[PDB]
């Protein structure tokens, strides 16, 4: 089947919420080993993030139900089932990234590279959201390394008002806050991003900015 047909399939699947179908069509689109356009990469991100976000949201409500409470063995089995689904789709997108997308980025394809590394860090952070013990330490370390390379390339070869750099900074702040329980470093990252972006796209910075006034 022609690649344009698959891209249309997943573009229309977004209008039908078959985000599983959208993610599948766009995963098979990445699996021809040819780099993606801006639109194709963006909607792949949208599809996979939507499915993992459904998993995340219902896992969060299940875990919150699991606290204020017998009949908990069923709740734990359900939470573990949601966990398995979540880390399955997370490993899928991570293997897509490592094998196809991050690799097809040249040493100076800066914007797309930092985009894909921020995505890798995001999905490893999602993995850490439900992980246990040392199995959590390894994934938070991997997410830290991904965000680290992404932030290095963000600071050096990128404009401090680029929405991709701003999104990486916002999600790095959210990682330092919600994963490392270090609101100091998170607020510091957000403050530096905002104070480098104020010098000269809008919504997102306000987003970062909206986090600041929510933590102060």
């Amino acid at each position: 089947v022609d690649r344009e047909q698959l891209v249309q399939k997943a573009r229309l699947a977004e209008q039908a919420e078959r985000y599983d179908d959208m993610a599948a069509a766009m995963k098979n689109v990445t699996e021809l080993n040819e780099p993606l356009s801006n639109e194709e990469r963006n909607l792949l991100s949208v599809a996979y993030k939507n499915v993992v976000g459904a998993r995340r949201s219902s896992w969060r409500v299940i875990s919150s139900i699991e606290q204020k409470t017998k009949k908990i063995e069923m709740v734990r089995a359900y939470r573990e089932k949601i966990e398995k689904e979540l880390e399955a789709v997370c490993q899928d997108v991570l293997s897509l990234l490592d094998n196809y997308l991050i690799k097809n980025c040249s040493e100076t394809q800066y914007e797309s590279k930092v985009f894909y590394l921020k995505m890798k860090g995001d999905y490893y952070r999602y993995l850490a959201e439900v992980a246990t013990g040392e199995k959590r330490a390894t994934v938070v370390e991997s997410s830290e390394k991904a965000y680290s390379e992404a932030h290095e390339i963000s600071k050096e070869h990128m404009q401090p008002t680029h929405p991709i750099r701003l999104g990486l900074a916002l999600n790095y702040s959210v990682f330092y806050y919600e994963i490392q329980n270090a609101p100091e470093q998170a607020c510091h990252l957000a403050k530096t991003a905002f104070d480098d972006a104020i010098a000269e796209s809008t919504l997102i910075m306000q987003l970062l900015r909206d986090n600041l006034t929510l933590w102060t």
């Binding site: 949208v46 993030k49 995001d122 999104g167 916002l170 999600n171 959210v174 919600e178 929510l214």
Partner: peptide, 7 residues
């Protein structure tokens, strides 16, 4: 949500 959504 607190991160960057629908993207």
């Amino acid at each position: 949500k607190l991160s960057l959504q629908e993207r």
